Amino acid sequence: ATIGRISTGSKSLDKLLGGGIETQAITEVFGEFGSGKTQLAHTLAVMVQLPPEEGGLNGSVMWIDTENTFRPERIREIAQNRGLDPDEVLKHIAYARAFNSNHQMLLVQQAEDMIKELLNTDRPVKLLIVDSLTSHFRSEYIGRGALAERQQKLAKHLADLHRLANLYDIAVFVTNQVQILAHSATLRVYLRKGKGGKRIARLIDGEAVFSITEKGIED
Ligand SMILES: c1ccc2[nH]ncc2c1
Structure with a gap:
């Protein structure tokens, strides 16, 4: 199946990414607390629902939240300000809180059931968010011997x-709060605060710059 692309809301960031975030890939955004990782996740959860000529995939969303940071009203705000019905957009996000890393792992396996269910509807799952990918792993696997154990479980x-x-032509988007370890994401994007409230993104193999606004993120 051909790759799909989802606009982030920012033309600058889309260009950095080669045209948006890709299906059949895991994109990891990483950076310090407050760098905008969760705002980007919220924006993508709206953008993916747009039709393809507007930068979406007519897709639904599954969201695994490990830090209680999902905000339904932020979804509704971004949706409304982009011309979409806020309640329809919110309804197309399946949401689960992961209580620990083992539950987080089960939830990913569990997500396959809904993915299969929706695969041939007009709004198949096209975006799976894990925010945060690493927080539970970091809290649970600590001390001598934990590096190997944590990396193996994360792998x-x-x-x-x-x-x-x-398998299902989905963009997986994950967040990681940071600041030598190996990573297995397809593409890693470093996010940081810049001047004037801007956020700056760099690929970790130019830089994109964007603002966080009532439309989520934009140039
Ligand atoms: C992951 C995210 C959301 C979900 N809703 N139901 C199952 C599930 C798994």
């Missing part, structure tokens, strides 16, 4: 996510 979790992305 299995990411393998599960890669399979869903690749």
Whole structure:
């Protein structure tokens, strides 16, 4: 199946990404607390629902939240300000709180049921968000011996996510709060605060600049 692309809301960031975030890929955004990772996730959860000529995939969303940071009213605000019905957009986001890393891993396996259910509807799942990918792993696997154990568990979790992305033509978007370890995401984007309230994004193989606004993010 051909890759799809989802606009982030920012032409600058879309260009950095080669045209938007890709299906059949895991895109990891990482950066310090407050760098805008969750705002980008909220924006993508709206953008993916747009029709393709507007930068979406006519898609539905599954969201795994590990920090209680999902805000339904932020979805509704972004949707309304982009001309979409806020309640329809919110309804197309399946939402689950992950209580610990083992529950987070089960939830990814569980997500396959809804993905299959929706695959041939007019709004198949096209975006799976894990925010935060790493927070539970960081709190639970700590101390001597934890590096190998945590990396092995994360590798299995990411393998599960890669399979869903690749098998069902989904963009997986994950967040990671940071600041030597290996990573298995398809593409890693470093996000940081800049001057004038801007956020700056760099690929970790130019820089994109965007603002956080009532439309989510934009140039
Ligand atoms: C992950 C995210 C949202 C979800 N809703 N139901 C199951 C599930 C898994």
